[PDB]
Structure 1
Amino acid sequence: QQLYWSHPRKFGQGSRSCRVCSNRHGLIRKYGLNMCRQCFRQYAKDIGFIKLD
């Protein structure tokens, strides 16, 4: 819009989300992942990881 509609967020929590629901806090950044821990579990079998130990 005009000169006010936004405030810079480009670091910290409000500038990242997740790709399966856009939820914040509880999420895994590591390996380029961007998935929230509750939903990560349900796509764990789907190529990713498998339990072994």
Structure 2
Amino acid sequence: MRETEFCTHIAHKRECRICGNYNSVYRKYGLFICRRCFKENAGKIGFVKL
């Protein structure tokens, strides 16, 4: 039934913690953060420009 087929695992689903976008999720460190969404919230995390 739809129950037995809905979302059968096919792949890992990885989304920015802030925006939920699959593209450019970023796994470099624990930060699963959108590449575009990162820049907006970099300051609260404290990542800073040299």
Q: TM-score range by the shorter chain?
A: 0.7 to 0.9
Q: Which has the higher helix share?
A: 2
Query: How many matched pairs?
Result: 49
Q: TM-score, normalised by structure 1?
A: 0.70
Q: TM-score, normalised by structure 2?
A: 0.72
Query: What is the CA–CA distance in structure 1 between the aligned matches of 2:23 and 2:10, rounded to whole Å?
Result: 16
Q: Which has the higher strand share?
A: 1
Structure 2 unmatched ranges of 5 or more: none
Structure 1 unmatched ranges of 5 or more: none
Higher relative contact order (CA 8 A, sep 6+): 2
- Runs of 4 or more above 2 Å deviation: none
Percent identical pairs in the alignment equals 41
